[PDB]
Write a protein that binds this ligand. Structure first.
Ligand SMILES: Nc1nc2c(ncn2[C@@H]2O[C@H](COP(=O)(O)O)[C@@H](O)[C@H]2O)c(=O)[nH]1
Ligand SMILES: [K+]
Lengths: 167, 173
């Protein structure tokens, strides 16, 4: 059966990168990561096809026109986006794909992947009002706790009657 | 309000054993709905712990008075979920847990369409799974318990529930 698409976001600085890293460190599960494309200049120590696929702005816009992104956004004059083909093929192989996107991107993703798992990482306890775009809300109080919560969510998704029924 | 959690599934699948294990875990926060039954009490069972044991007369008078969320006949005996405990306990904010056979679960679904329905499946039925939200295989008791636990945790993390909390809190201030 198809792998899940798992989409993690949250406000900038909430710690989504740190939580994602811990999740991918967990040997109980096996996730695949999408390498994003960007049009920003490559920095010291970075490798094309590892940190990012680095593209010209014209190439990125050609790819947008040909509908080759699940989602994209422009930040300070540079585009960033998730290529569609890798994610599609990888899910078709039966692997769960675990994406990190910026908050407003959920709407774009959900149009193409309505049954994806959308997880909003929230800071500990108003602009956080963008959670309405998401399926689940997980508080990043501590990295280990946030990871465990996300792992219950993904585990539960695998137990969903729809999946098991079709199976 | 707390969640209504419904564990059901085919006869002999091990609903009782898994429920038992769930409530032996000190980290389990749910409150168990003690059912009424008209079957005879068995060695080791305690009235008001395992079940509220009732006569058929009393059970039927309670049916007539609409005092059950659900009830069913199973191998010649009545079993049912008293309404007041579930309503009061959910109102207090506690999750309430039902362990019931499949006909009773259908009645619960009609009255509580947003309840959490978990179907306990044998390690080996497809038609039976239709109304349910989740399917958990009873391959082993500890494994089944843990799966149910992460399903309930995930339901507490649903955005609709979390958002409603945050909104009430912002409006309150
Ligand atoms: N519908 C319904 N089934 C119940 C209730 N309580 C127990 N059962 C089910 O009745 C069956 C017989 O239980 P036992 O007689 O073995 O304790 C089990 O499958 C159990 O899940 C109840 O309150 N309602
Ligand atoms: K019961």
């Amino acid at each position: 059966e198809k792998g899940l698409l798992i989409v993690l976001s949250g406000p900038s600085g909430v710690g989504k990168g740190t939580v994602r890293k811990r999740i991918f460190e967990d040997p109980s599960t096996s996730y695949k990561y999408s390498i994003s494309m960007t049009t920003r200049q490559m920095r010291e120590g970075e490798v094309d096809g590892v940190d990012y696929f680095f593209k010209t702005r014209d190439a990125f816009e050609a790819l947008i026109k040909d509908d080759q992104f699940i989602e994209y956004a422009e930040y300070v004059g540079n585009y960033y986006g998730t290529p569609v083909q890798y994610v599609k093929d990888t899910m078709d192989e039966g692997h769960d794909v675990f994406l990190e996107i910026e908050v407003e991107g959920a709407k774009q993703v959900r149009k193409k992947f309505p049954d994806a798992l959308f997880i909003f990482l929230a800071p500990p306890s108003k602009e956080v009002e963008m959670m309405n775009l998401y399926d689940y809300v997980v508080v990043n109080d501590e990295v280990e706790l946030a990871k465990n919560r996300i792992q219950c969510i993904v585990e539960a998704e695998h137990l969903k009657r729809e999946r098991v029924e079709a199976k």
